[PDB]
Design an enzyme around this catalytic site. Structure first.
Site, PDB file in Angstrom:
ATOM      1  N   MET A  93      30.361   6.911 -62.918  1.00 54.61           N
ATOM      2  CA  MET A  93      30.298   7.832 -64.043  1.00 54.61           C
ATOM      3  C   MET A  93      29.296   8.946 -63.763  1.00 54.61           C
ATOM      4  O   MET A  93      28.244   8.722 -63.158  1.00 54.61           O
ATOM      5  CB  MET A  93      29.888   7.061 -65.299  1.00 54.61           C
ATOM      6  CG  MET A  93      29.165   7.877 -66.367  1.00 54.61           C
ATOM      7  SD  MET A  93      30.252   8.698 -67.552  1.00 54.61           S
ATOM      8  CE  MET A  93      29.073   9.137 -68.828  1.00 54.61           C
ATOM      9  N   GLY A 130      47.651  12.878 -71.671  1.00 53.60           N
ATOM     10  CA  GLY A 130      48.284  12.669 -72.964  1.00 53.60           C
ATOM     11  C   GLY A 130      47.490  11.777 -73.898  1.00 53.60           C
ATOM     12  O   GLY A 130      47.728  11.791 -75.112  1.00 53.60           O
ATOM     13  N   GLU A 157      24.087  -5.570 -63.457  1.00 53.37           N
ATOM     14  CA  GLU A 157      25.056  -4.886 -64.303  1.00 53.37           C
ATOM     15  C   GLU A 157      26.439  -5.524 -64.206  1.00 53.37           C
ATOM     16  O   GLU A 157      27.434  -4.891 -64.573  1.00 53.37           O
ATOM     17  CB  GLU A 157      25.117  -3.397 -63.956  1.00 53.37           C
TER      18      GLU A 157
HETATM   19  N1  LIG Z   1      29.736  -4.143 -71.347  1.00 45.70           N
HETATM   20  C1  LIG Z   1      30.478  -3.109 -70.882  1.00 45.70           C
HETATM   21  N2  LIG Z   1      30.033  -2.419 -69.806  1.00 45.70           N
HETATM   22  C2  LIG Z   1      30.748  -1.381 -69.311  1.00 45.70           C
HETATM   23  C3  LIG Z   1      32.016  -1.007 -69.956  1.00 45.70           C
HETATM   24  N3  LIG Z   1      32.504   0.042 -69.267  1.00 45.70           N
HETATM   25  C4  LIG Z   1      31.626   0.314 -68.267  1.00 45.70           C
HETATM   26  N4  LIG Z   1      30.580  -0.534 -68.299  1.00 45.70           N
HETATM   27  C5  LIG Z   1      29.422  -0.549 -67.374  1.00 45.70           C
HETATM   28  O1  LIG Z   1      29.386   0.651 -66.598  1.00 45.70           O
HETATM   29  C6  LIG Z   1      29.034   0.354 -65.248  1.00 45.70           C
HETATM   30  C7  LIG Z   1      29.963   1.116 -64.320  1.00 45.70           C
HETATM   31  O2  LIG Z   1      31.299   0.992 -64.807  1.00 45.70           O
HETATM   32  P1  LIG Z   1      32.418   0.354 -63.844  1.00 45.70           P
HETATM   33  O3  LIG Z   1      33.072  -0.833 -64.511  1.00 45.70           O
HETATM   34  O4  LIG Z   1      31.781  -0.065 -62.547  1.00 45.70           O
HETATM   35  O5  LIG Z   1      33.475   1.556 -63.654  1.00 45.70           O
HETATM   36  P2  LIG Z   1      33.259   2.682 -62.522  1.00 45.70           P
HETATM   37  O6  LIG Z   1      31.895   3.297 -62.717  1.00 45.70           O
HETATM   38  O7  LIG Z   1      34.295   3.769 -62.646  1.00 45.70           O
HETATM   39  O8  LIG Z   1      33.365   2.066 -61.149  1.00 45.70           O
HETATM   40  C8  LIG Z   1      29.190  -1.146 -65.046  1.00 45.70           C
HETATM   41  O9  LIG Z   1      27.968  -1.709 -64.557  1.00 45.70           O
HETATM   42  C9  LIG Z   1      29.522  -1.719 -66.408  1.00 45.70           C
HETATM   43  O10 LIG Z   1      28.580  -2.736 -66.764  1.00 45.70           O
HETATM   44  C10 LIG Z   1      32.432  -1.809 -71.126  1.00 45.70           C
HETATM   45  O11 LIG Z   1      33.493  -1.568 -71.739  1.00 45.70           O
HETATM   46  N5  LIG Z   1      31.629  -2.806 -71.506  1.00 45.70           N
END
Ligand SMILES: Nc1nc2c(ncn2[C@@H]2O[C@H](COP(=O)(O)OP(=O)(O)O)[C@@H](O)[C@H]2O)c(=O)[nH]1
Ligand SMILES: Nc1nc2c(ncn2[C@@H]2O[C@H](COP(=O)(O)OP(=O)(O)O)[C@@H](O)[C@H]2O)c(=O)[nH]1
Ligand SMILES: [Mg+2]
Ligand SMILES: [Mg+2]
Ligand SMILES: [Mg+2]
Ligand SMILES: [Mg+2]
Lengths: 205, 203
Positions: A93, A130, A157
């Protein structure tokens, strides 16, 4: 040809409303817009999934013609996939004021233990406009794939990630076969299949 | 390839966080870890909006692609304009086939009849946060029949047909003028496969 017909001046966002706020948000956009045949539409509402935007890094070793893939569970894949563990690009992100390149380089270290040399933009795309605002900006990053191994991700995390190294040819064949089937990896690897010859020449000079 | 299967994850429950036209669900689950253990209970918010069929309308005689232009308000905050150039596409309802949806949307959105079809790829749009899968087909069309304004007006669908050469469409991908996943994937695939596809469909 000329391209699209209308601009931001041709739409009025009357109101937005957050219907759900948690880790992500679901917003209701209320708007009216110009029609191709002349007039203005009535008021229209659309539910939009708001989850921020991402930086994506394709780790490519131009000396070895290899890519580094990261494997992790994506539970949303469960209902339509044989397994929810996916082979993917490094991705993270983007926070306020952060650049795509800074996020891509940081995530490459956190998720794959990879130092990145040069980078080049691939493409920036809307995942599914969309229903979600999400934009992902892809870079290709120069890596030494012989350094890529092991288990990474931020354990504090709940991020559990395994590194895989394959030939570019194998990664692309997996796209063709449906074994790699997430948008970011499909786009990055199809781009690589179209550009790798020039990219290897550029980065091994 | 991948390490773990559905034997290695349990979805304990799903909770509806929002139910409207679309849904947002909380998945509660545990899963095996690469280090050999089991995770604790993990939760993730997942946007549930069904799944889509996507059609790349390709004229193999003329080497032309049909694009559809319509507003996508979600593009507004990160794009020069919310009007996008896209592939024909629509939601797959219960019991429908990808191909039946693609043909219906090609007629509704572009006034196009489709001849032969071939699968391109089926992809997850953004599986960290949504379950959405989109299945892309390439469909044989006569691009000379593609023109005008379409879309179901009774559904707030206002769509303009554009016809470009294949090379023109791909240049627009390179330049960022086409920048939605479904079109980027379809047009990159076309740039990798057009020679064999044109031969198959003209000989
Ligand atoms: N608890 C919780 N954590 C989230 C959620 N979405 C993202 N995160 C946190 O955001 C961090 C990065 O998101 P990730 O799942 O790795 O998606 P990415 O960053 O696109 O690879 C992770 O350490 C997750 O803990 C969610 O819906 N719930
Ligand atoms: N009320 C409402 N309708 C929607 C929304 N998104 C899509 N639709 C419906 O979808 C239909 C056509 O829009 P579109 O999303 O392009 O459908 P598709 O082409 O089959 O995917 C219309 O009848 C709309 O009512 C939304 O957020 N709210
Ligand atoms: Mg990540
Ligand atoms: Mg990360
Ligand atoms: Mg549509
Ligand atoms: Mg439609």
């Amino acid at each position: 040809q000329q391209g699209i017909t209308f601009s931001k001046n041709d739409v009025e966002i009357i109101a937005r409303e957050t219907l759900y706020r948690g880790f992500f948000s679901l917003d209701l956009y209320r708007f009216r817009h110009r029609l191709f045949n002349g007039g203005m539409s009535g008021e229209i509402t659309r539910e939009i999934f708001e989850r921020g935007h991402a930086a994506v890094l394709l780790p490519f070793d131009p000396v070895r013609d290899e890519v580094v893939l990261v494997e992790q569970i994506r539970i949303a894949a469960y209902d339509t996939s044989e397994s929810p563990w996916l082979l993917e690009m490094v991705a993270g992100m983007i926070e306020a004021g952060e650049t795509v390149e800074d996020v891509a380089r940081r995530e490459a270290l956190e998720e794959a233990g990879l130092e990145v040399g040069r980078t080049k933009p691939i493409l920036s795309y809307l995942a599914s406009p969309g229903g979600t605002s999400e934009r992902l900006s892809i870079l290709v990053g120069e890596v030494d794939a012989s350094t890529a191994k092991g288990i990474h991700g931020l354990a504090e995390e709940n991020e559990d990630i395994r590194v895989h190294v394959v030939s570019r040819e194998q990664a692309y064949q997996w796209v063709e076969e449906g074994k790699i089937d997430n948008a970011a990896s499909v786009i990055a690897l199809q781009w690589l299949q179209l550009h790798y010859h020039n990219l290897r020449n550029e980065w091994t000079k």
